[PDB]
Enzyme design. Structure first.
Site, PDB file in Angstrom:
ATOM      1  N   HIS A  30     -20.602  90.803 -21.420  1.00 11.90           N
ATOM      2  CA  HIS A  30     -19.117  90.740 -20.564  1.00 11.90           C
ATOM      3  C   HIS A  30     -18.201  91.780 -21.141  1.00 11.90           C
ATOM      4  CE1 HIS A  30     -20.604  86.708 -19.198  1.00 11.90           C
ATOM      5  NE2 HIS A  30     -20.484  86.420 -20.261  1.00 11.90           N
ATOM      6  N   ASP A  71     -29.583  86.179 -18.812  1.00  8.41           N
ATOM      7  CA  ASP A  71     -28.627  85.387 -19.118  1.00  8.41           C
ATOM      8  C   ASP A  71     -28.084  84.486 -18.222  1.00  8.41           C
ATOM      9  OD1 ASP A  71     -25.457  84.624 -19.937  1.00  8.41           O
ATOM     10  OD2 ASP A  71     -26.471  85.362 -21.971  1.00  8.41           O
ATOM     11  N   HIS A 115     -25.052  83.742 -17.316  1.00 11.54           N
ATOM     12  CA  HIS A 115     -23.828  84.346 -16.713  1.00 11.54           C
ATOM     13  C   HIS A 115     -24.034  85.479 -16.355  1.00 11.54           C
ATOM     14  CE1 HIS A 115     -22.972  81.295 -20.205  1.00 11.54           C
ATOM     15  NE2 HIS A 115     -21.879  80.978 -19.189  1.00 11.54           N
ATOM     16  N   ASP A 129     -29.375  81.153 -22.457  1.00 10.63           N
ATOM     17  CA  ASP A 129     -28.441  79.907 -22.025  1.00 10.63           C
ATOM     18  C   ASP A 129     -28.807  79.494 -20.653  1.00 10.63           C
ATOM     19  OD1 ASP A 129     -27.590  82.454 -21.088  1.00 10.63           O
ATOM     20  OD2 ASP A 129     -25.415  82.094 -21.833  1.00 10.63           O
ATOM     21  N   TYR A 149     -27.673  79.045 -26.706  1.00 13.88           N
ATOM     22  CA  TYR A 149     -26.677  78.030 -27.566  1.00 13.88           C
ATOM     23  C   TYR A 149     -27.180  77.170 -28.082  1.00 13.88           C
ATOM     24  CZ  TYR A 149     -23.545  81.524 -25.792  1.00 13.88           C
ATOM     25  OH  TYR A 149     -23.268  82.596 -25.279  1.00 13.88           O
TER      26      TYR A 149
HETATM   27  O1  JNN Z   1     -15.171  79.992 -24.062  1.00 14.79           O
HETATM   28  C1  JNN Z   1     -16.111  79.366 -23.942  1.00 14.79           C
HETATM   29  N1  JNN Z   1     -16.876  79.520 -22.556  1.00 14.79           N
HETATM   30  C2  JNN Z   1     -16.559  80.700 -21.605  1.00 14.79           C
HETATM   31  C3  JNN Z   1     -17.052  82.157 -22.461  1.00 14.79           C
HETATM   32  C4  JNN Z   1     -18.628  82.213 -22.527  1.00 14.79           C
HETATM   33  C5  JNN Z   1     -19.101  83.281 -22.528  1.00 14.79           C
HETATM   34  C6  JNN Z   1     -20.770  82.859 -22.529  1.00 14.79           C
HETATM   35  C7  JNN Z   1     -21.941  83.413 -22.472  1.00 14.79           C
HETATM   36  O2  JNN Z   1     -23.010  82.981 -22.757  1.00 14.79           O
HETATM   37  N2  JNN Z   1     -22.125  84.520 -21.645  1.00 14.79           N
HETATM   38  O3  JNN Z   1     -23.146  85.023 -21.181  1.00 14.79           O
HETATM   39  N3  JNN Z   1     -20.794  81.496 -22.817  1.00 14.79           N
HETATM   40  O4  JNN Z   1     -19.174  81.261 -22.677  1.00 14.79           O
HETATM   41  C8  JNN Z   1     -16.651  78.291 -24.534  1.00 14.79           C
HETATM   42  C9  JNN Z   1     -16.341  77.847 -25.936  1.00 14.79           C
HETATM   43  C10 JNN Z   1     -16.653  76.626 -26.585  1.00 14.79           C
HETATM   44  C11 JNN Z   1     -17.368  75.904 -25.806  1.00 14.79           C
HETATM   45 CL1  JNN Z   1     -17.917  74.316 -26.894  1.00 14.79          CL
HETATM   46  C12 JNN Z   1     -17.683  76.106 -24.643  1.00 14.79           C
HETATM   47 CL2  JNN Z   1     -18.531  74.711 -23.671  1.00 14.79          CL
HETATM   48  C13 JNN Z   1     -17.291  77.132 -23.817  1.00 14.79           C
HETATM   49  K     K Z   2     -27.284  87.427 -15.901  1.00 15.96           K
HETATM   50 ZN    ZN Z   3     -24.380  83.525 -21.199  1.00 12.76          ZN
END
Ligand code: JNN
Ligand code: K
Ligand code: ZN
Ligand code: K
Length: 354
Positions: free
Chosen positions: A133, A171, A173, A264, A304
């Site tokens: 990201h 991934d 995302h 993930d 995660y």
């Molecule tokens: O900020 C959160 N999520 C949005 C950001 C993000 C990036 C990724 C990821 O895996 N990117 O590939 N994964 O998330 C977040 C923080 C704490 C919890 Cl418990 C949750 Cl469910 C989301």
């Molecule tokens: K991807």
């Molecule tokens: Zn991710």
């Protein structure tokens, strides 16, 4: 016929001082490493040392302001770490964050070097924080510097500017930062599979849709495979690799393959909501090993569920070591729709899809 592995416990020091249960946990990497020992994979690998990326290496993809700002966080008090983190979308920072980000990148450079100098055939990098990201000029989504993008530029810097690098981002995302960094580049083919949900899934941008095919001389060199309509699993991933990833990759003929290997999309992941199994990840890895004379570097991104990521990444290393792939339904309707949308978007650029 050797597989490299890089892991350094120093990358555990990056932590969330306000929320010790935040899912991007230090233990992600130690759990994966432990599982590699339990399954007797660690002793079968050539251990590659971590090192810090240099600031000049970071400048392969990042602005000096961005590097400067992240570096400044090393001596900040809590209040200021909070403030700085909050300038980004979904970032936490500790005093150790910058060093850990440097180690993640430098680990991957050493792994790419080991492959390109013929010291190993393929490699795995158990690193955190993640990278995909991160943008030229900003941190995002738990990522500070774009490890995989930097690794492609580092590989080009020790070979040739036009070295053909395929980045497969599995991934769950979209790697918005990787797509942006390479959007006008025909030397780096970016292929992402990602949950999209018409923009409801992080990072919430139409940049991740199938019609974003690359720009300028990079047109055709960006392939987004976006999923809509809830849970996907091995059938959908295998079909996307069959119909899209592998035909396009073969036509591009990469000289190095980097995997932005978040885990993930795995069964059990609380953020991804998907069902890819460890055997599924083994098959995706075994397919990628058919490219680039086997020159494949697997780079941890997200993922995660500690048990899921440990089993999944270990299965990938087992495939890199040459073990036989393990034994593995019709696709969800919306998955068929996604694949066909990508085929239509990319048929003008790739004869294999016609
Ligand atoms: O900020 C959160 N999520 C949005 C950001 C993000 C990036 C990724 C990821 O895996 N990117 O590939 N994964 O998330 C977040 C923080 C704490 C919890 Cl418990 C949750 Cl469910 C989301
Ligand atoms: K991807
Ligand atoms: Zn991710
Ligand atoms: K590209």
């Amino acid at each position: 016929p050797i597989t490299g592995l890089v892991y350094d416990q120093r990358m555990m020091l990056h932590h969330n001082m306000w929320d010790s249960h935040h899912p991007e946990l230090p233990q992600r990497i130690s759990r994966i490493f432990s599982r590699h020992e339990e399954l007797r994979l660690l002793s079968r690998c050539h251990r590659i040392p971590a090192r810090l990326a240099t600031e000049e290496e970071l400048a392969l993809c990042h602005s000096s302001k961005h590097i400067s700002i992240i570096k400044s966080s090393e001596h900040m008090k809590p209040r200021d770490l909070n403030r700085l983190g909050d300038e980004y979308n979904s970032i936490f920072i500790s005093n150790e964050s910058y060093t850990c980000a440097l180690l993640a990148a430098g680990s991957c450079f050493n792994s790419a070097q080991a492959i390109l100098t013929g010291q190993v055939r393929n490699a795995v990098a158990i690193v955190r924080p993640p990278g995909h990201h991160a943008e030229k000029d900003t941190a995002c989504g738990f990522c500070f510097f774009n490890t995989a993008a930097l690794t492609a530029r580092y590989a080009q810097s020790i070979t040739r500017e036009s070295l053909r690098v395929l980045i497969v981002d599995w991934d769950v995302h979209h790697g918005n930062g990787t797509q942006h960094i390479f959007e006008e580049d025909d030397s780096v083919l970016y292929i992402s599979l990602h949950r999209y949900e018409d923009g409801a899934f992080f990072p919430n941008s139409e940049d991740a849709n199938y019609d974003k095919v690359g720009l300028g001389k990079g047109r055709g060199y960006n392939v987004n495979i976006p999923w809509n309509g809830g849970k996907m699993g091995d059938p959908e991933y295998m079909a996307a690799f069959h119909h899209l990833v592998m035909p396009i990759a073969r036509e591009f003929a990469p000289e190095l393959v980097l995997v932005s290997a978040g885990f993930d999309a795995a069964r059990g992941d609380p953020l991804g909501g998907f069902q890819v199994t460890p055997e599924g990840y083994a098959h995706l890895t075994h397919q990628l090993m058919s490219l680039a004379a086997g020159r494949v570097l697997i780079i941890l991104e997200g993922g995660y569920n500690l048990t899921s990521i440990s089993e999944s990444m270990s299965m990938c290393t087992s495939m890199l070591l040459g073990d036989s792939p393990p034994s593995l339904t019709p696709l969800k309707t919306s998955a068929t729709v996604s694949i066909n949308n990508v085929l239509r978007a990319h048929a003008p650029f790739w004869s294999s899809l016609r």
